[PDB]
Symmetry: C3
Subunit: 321 residues, 3 copies
C-alpha cells in the first residue's frame, strides 16, 4: 500500500473575463480596471488654484467689464469659464480672440501696472451708457477712450520704453463709429488711424464707419488688439483719431496656468486631475471621462474598460449540473 | 522484438518568410498578408453617396459658375474633384480658399435658400462677358452684383436675423476694379468699403483698384468671403460701393461628408473604403495604397508587405 | 565508483541592472545603451553641405543686406543661423517671417536670376545711410527702391511671365514713410498702393505713414512680401507709390534642405545626424540630446538611459 501526492492550483467560484493575444475573452481568477470611467461631478479646489469666472469670461475680466471688476489683479492655475458668462460693456470684437485668450490664460495673471501716458490735446476717460459703472456711464477699466478737446484732436505720438526685465502685454483698441456724424463729432478728422509699433513689428488699423447689430443701444463697435514689448524694446502709439488707449500693461509670466470651459461646481477636496466633468482620480493609467484635462491625468482612450489579469487562469471543476 | 513510436510535425516543400523579434526572415508553413497594396482603380458608388464634380470644383458649384448650375442643391457623402476642372465666370480669388472648401465639403450640401434683401437705390443683377449665360452676359447665380442707379450709390445698410435652428452660411464678395474710371463709373464713390458683421464678429474689406493678369477679358477681380450666422444671431451688411451681395444663405449640416481629389472613374460596386487611387478592400488592418482615405479603411503604413505567421516553423525533409 | 556531471551557466562579478515586464531592476550579465545622451559639441561638415550664416540670418542673406553679400547664390543642405547675427540695412519687418524663412530654407538655394523689369517714369536704385555699401548709401542688393523722376511718379504697371519649367520666387516690399513730407517728397502721391498678383491670387498693401522706433537713423520701415509664380503663370505688379521692386527671382527647388539655430562650431568630421548641440552618433535607436535634429537621427525620447539586456540573468557565486 503506497501513497498518492497530487500537485494543483486554486480556483475561485466567480472569475473575470480578460483579453489576451489569442482570446478576446478568457477567464482568470482576478483582474483590475485600468480605465477611469467616472468622475465626482465636482472640480476639487486643491491642490491647484482654481478661479471661478462666474459671470465673466477671461477676456471680459482682462478688459475690465464693470461686473468683472472683482477679478482685477487675480491669479490662477486654472481659470474656469462658465456657460452663463455674459458681457455688459461696450460691444467689442477681438480679431484672433482665441490667441489672446490663450496667451493670457497661459500667463496665469491679470496683474496690471498703470503707466503715465501723456495724451496732449484730447479728452480722456470717455464713457457710455452701454457700460454702466455705478449709476452713470462708464467704460472698460483698463482702457482709456480718447476724444477731441475743444475743436481739435491732434496727431497723438507717444512712447513707453520697457526698462524692466520682464515682458509687458499692452491691450488697446480701435473705435468704429456707427455714422460719419459720430466720427467727426468724436474725433474731428473724417477718417482715423491707429498705428502701434515696437522696433521690430507694427500693426496699423483703419476704422470702418457703419452699422453693426444693435447691442445695448449701439451699432458702433470697438476692436481689440494687443502688443508685447520685450525688455529693451519700446512701444510707440501714433493716432489721429479712434484710438482706445491702454492705461498700462499686464505683467506676463510663464508657468503651469491654463483655462477650461466647465459648469461643474467647485468643491473642497483634493485632486491632481481636473476635467470639465469634474475631477477624476489618477491611480489608473487610462481614462475615458474627457479628452480635455488639466494636471497629472491618466491618458484619454476610447475604451470604457480594460482589464489587467491579476491571477491565473480559472479552471473550475466540471459539474454534471 | 519491440516497436518504435515517433512524434512529429508537418512541413511543406515551399514555406513563407516572416519577421520575428530575433529574425528578419524565418520560414513558416503559412502566413497571411496584413497590408492592402492594390486597388481596383475605380471608386465604388456604394455605400457612400459619390458626387462627381466633372468640370467643376466645389467652390465653383457653390458660387454658381454657369457650367456648374447642374450642381444646385446637390448633396454628397464624398465630393470628387477632377484635375480637368476649370472656372469660366468672373475671375476671383478666395482668401482662405482651403477653409471655405473644407467647411462646405463637410456640410455635404449646396442647399440654398433665397432671402428678400432690400437694396434701396442701386441697380441689381450686374453681369459680365466673362461669365456668359445664354446669348448674354451673366454672373454667379448665388451672388448679386450691385451698381449705381442713376447718378448715385447710397450707403447700403441691411439686416437678416437667423430665427431658424440651423447655421446659415452667407457667401459674399468685394469687387476690385481695374481702373479709377471703372470704380467711379460703377459705384460713384472713389473708394468703396464692405463691412459684414454679426453680434460678436466683423470683417471689413477695402477694395484695391489696379490690374491683375488678363482672365477672360478682365484685369479686375472679385474677392470672396463668408460669414456663418448661428441661431439667434443676426447678419448686417453695410457698404458704400464694391459689394457683391449674397442672394440668400446655404443651409449648413454636420455629418460624415468630405471631399477628395481623384481622377479614378466611378463604378457600380460596393466598397466601404475609398482612396484617390480607387476603392480598396478593408479586410486587412493596414494599407500602403494612399494616405488619403475616406470611410472604414485600413490604417496607412509605409511597408508594402507585412506577414502574420499562421503556422509553425517549416523544417523540410 | 561513479561520476558526477553538472550542467551550468556563466556569471560575472559586476552585472548590469535592466528593466523587464515584471521588474524595474533586475541584474543581467551584460547590457547595451539605447539612448544617445552626449554630443561632440561640434557640427560635422560632412556628409551634409553646411552653410554657416556667421553674422547673417537667412532672410538678410536673401534680401541682400551688404554684410551678407558673400552669401549671394549660395546653396546648402543645412543653413546654420547664429545668435550673434545682426541686420545692418534698412529697418524692415516680414509679415509671416516664419513662413518665408521656412520656404527659402527648404528650397536650399539663394540662386538669383536678374530680370529686365521696365519701370517707366521713375528713378531706380534708391539708397539710404542706414544701409551702407562701401562708404556711400546703399540698399538691399535684390531690391530696387523706386522714387519719383523729376516731379512725377506715374502709375507703374508691369508684367513678367514665367515661361520656364520651374517655380519662381519673387521678393518685394512696401515702404512706410515716417511723415507726409517724406511720402510726397519720394512718391508725389499722398497715399501709395502696391498690388502684386498672379492669375489666381493677389496681395494688396496700403502703406502706413508714421513713426516707428528709431533704428539706424530711421523711424520709417519696409515691409517684405513674396509671390511664387508657377510655370505658365504671370506676375503683375501695379503701384502708384511706395513700391520696393524685385530685381528678379529666386529659383525654387525641392529636396533635403533645412535651417537650424545653433552656436556649435563647425568641424572637419563625418556625421549623419546634426543637432543644435552638435553632431551625434546614430548607432543607437533613441536620443535625449535635442528634439531638434537634421539627417539620419535616433528618435528623441525623454529617458536619459534605457538598457537592452545582451545576456542572461546574473546569479553570482
Ligand atoms: C442699419 O440697419 C439696421 C437694420 O434696419 C438698423 O438697426 C436697427 O435699428 C433699430 C433702431 O435703433 C433697432 O431697434 C431697437 O431694437 C431693440 C430690440 O432688440 C429695442 O430695445 C429698441 O427699442 C428702444 O429704442 C427705440 C429708439 O430707437 C425706442 O423707440 C423704443 O421705445 C425703445 O426705447 C429698438 O427697437 C434694431 O434693433 C436695429 N436692428 C439691428 C439688427 O441691429 C440700423 O439702425 C441702421 N443704421 C442706420 C444708420 O440707419
Ligand atoms: C497693365 O499691363 C498689362 C500688361 O501689358 C496689361 O494687360 C495686358 O493687356 C493686353 C491688352 O489689353 C492683353 O492682351 C490680350 O490678351 C490675350 C492673350 O491672353 C492669353 O492667351 C493667348 C492665347 O489665346 C496667349 O497667346 C497669350 O500669351 C496670353 O497668355 C489675347 O487673346 C488678346 O488678343 C490680347 O493680346 C494682355 O494679355 C494683358 N496681359 C496681362 C498679363 O494681363 C494691362 O492692360 C495694363 N493695365 C492697364 C490699365 O493699362
Ligand atoms: C481582486 O481584484 C480586485 C480589484 O479588481 C480587488 O479589490 C480591490 O481591493 C483593494 C484593496 O486590496 C481595494 O482598495 C481599498 O479601498 C479602500 C476604500 O474602498 C481604501 O480605504 C483602501 O486603502 C484600499 O485602497 C479596492 O477598493 C478593491 N476594488 C474593487 C473594485 O473591488 C480584490 O482585493 C482582489 N482580490 C484578491 C483576492 O486579491
Ligand atoms: C514721435 O515720438 C517719438 C518719441 O518721442 C520720436 O522718436 C524719437 O526721435 C528722436 C529724434 O528726435 C530719437 O533720438 C535719437 O537717438 C539717438 C540715439 O538713440 C541719437 O544718436 C540721435 O541724436 C537722436 O537724438 C529717439 O530715439 C526717438 N525715440 C524712439 C523711441 O524711437 C518721434 O520722432 C516722434 N515723431 C514726431 C513726428 O513727433
Ligand atoms: C463628460 O462630459 C462629456 C462632454 O459633455 C460627455 O460626453 C459627451 O456627451 C454627448 C451626449 O450629450 C455624447 O454624444 C458625446 O460622446 C460627448 N460629447 C463630446 C463633445 O465629447 C461624457 O459622457 C461625460 N463623461 C462622464 C463620465 O461624465
Ligand atoms: C542640448 O542643448 C539643449 C538646448 O539648449 C539643452 O537643454 C537645456 O538644458 C537644461 C536641461 O537639459 C535646461 O536648463 C534648459 O532649459 C534646456 N533648454 C531647452 C531649450 O531644452 C540640453 O541640455 C543639451 N544637451 C546636451 C547633451 O548637451
Ligand atoms: C495690482 O498690482 C500692482 C502692483 O503689484 C498695484 O500697484 C495695483 O494697485 C494693483 N491693483 C489692484 C486693483 O489691486
Ligand atoms: C494559410 O492561411 C490562410 C489564413 O488562415 C488560409 O486561408 C489558407 O487556406 C492557408 N493555406 C494553407 C495552404 O494552409
Ligand atoms: C496611388 O496613387 C499615389 C498618388 O498618386 C501613388 O504614388 C501610389 O503609388 C498609388 N498606389 C497604387 C497601389 O496604386
Ligand atoms: C558586454 O558587451 C560587449 C560584447 O557584446 C563586450 O565588449 C563587453 O566586454 C561585454 N561585457 C561583459 C561584462 O561581458
Ligand atoms: C547667380 O546664378 C548664376 C550662376 O550659376 C548666374 O546667372 C549669376 O551670375 C550668379 N550670380 C552670382 C553673384 O554668383
Amino acid at each position: 500500500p503506497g501513497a498518492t501526492l497530487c500537485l494543483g492550483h486554486h480556483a475561485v467560484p466567480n472569475g473575470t473575463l480578460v483579453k489576451t493575444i489569442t482570446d478576446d475573452q478568457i477567464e482568470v481568477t482576478n483582474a483590475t480596471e485600468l480605465v477611469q470611467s467616472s468622475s465626482t461631478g465636482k472640480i476639487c479646489n486643491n491642490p491647484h488654484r482654481i478661479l471661478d469666472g462666474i459671470d465673466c469670461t477671461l477676456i471680459d475680466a482682462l478688459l475690465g467689464d464693470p461686473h468683472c471688476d472683482v477679478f482685477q489683479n487675480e491669479t490662477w492655475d486654472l481659470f474656469v469659464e462658465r456657460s452663463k458668462a455674459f458681457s455688459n460693456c461696450y460691444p467689442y470684437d477681438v480679431p484672433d480672440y482665441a490667441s489672446l485668450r490663450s496667451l493670457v490664460a497661459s500667463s496665469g495673471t491679470l496683474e496690471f501696472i498703470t503707466e503715465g501716458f501723456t495724451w496732449t490735446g484730447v479728452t480722456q476717460n470717455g464713457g457710455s451708457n452701454a457700460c454702466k459703472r455705478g449709476p452713470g456711464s462708464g467704460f472698460f477699466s483698463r482702457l482709456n477712450w480718447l476724444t477731441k478737446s475743444g475743436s481739435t484732436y491732434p496727431v497723438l505720438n507717444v512712447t513707453m520704453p520697457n526698462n524692466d526685465n520682464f515682458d509687458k502685454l499692452y491691450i488697446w483698441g480701435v473705435h468704429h463709429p456707427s455714422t460719419n456724424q459720430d466720427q467727426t463729432s468724436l474725433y474731428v478728422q473724417a477718417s482715423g488711424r491707429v498705428t502701434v509699433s515696437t522696433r521690430r513689428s507694427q500693426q496699423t488699423i483703419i476704422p470702418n464707419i457703419g452699422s453693426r447689430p444693435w447691442v445695448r443701444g449701439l451699432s458702433s463697435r470697438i476692436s481689440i488688439y494687443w502688443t508685447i514689448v520685450k525688455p529693451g524694446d519700446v512701444l510707440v502709439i501714433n493716432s489721429n483719431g479712434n484710438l482706445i488707449a491702454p492705461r498700462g500693461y499686464f505683467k506676463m509670466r510663464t508657468g503651469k496656468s491654463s483655462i477650461m470651459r466647465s459648469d461643474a461646481p467647485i468643491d473642497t477636496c483634493i485632486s491632481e486631475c481636473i476635467t470639465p466633468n469634474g475631477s477624476i482620480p489618477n491611480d489608473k493609467p487610462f481614462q475615458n471621462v474627457n479628452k480635455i484635462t488639466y494636471g497629472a491625468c491618466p491618458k484619454y482612450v476610447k475604451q470604457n474598460t480594460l482589464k489587467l489579469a491579476t491571477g491565473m487562469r480559472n479552471v473550475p471543476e466540471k459539474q454534471t449540473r
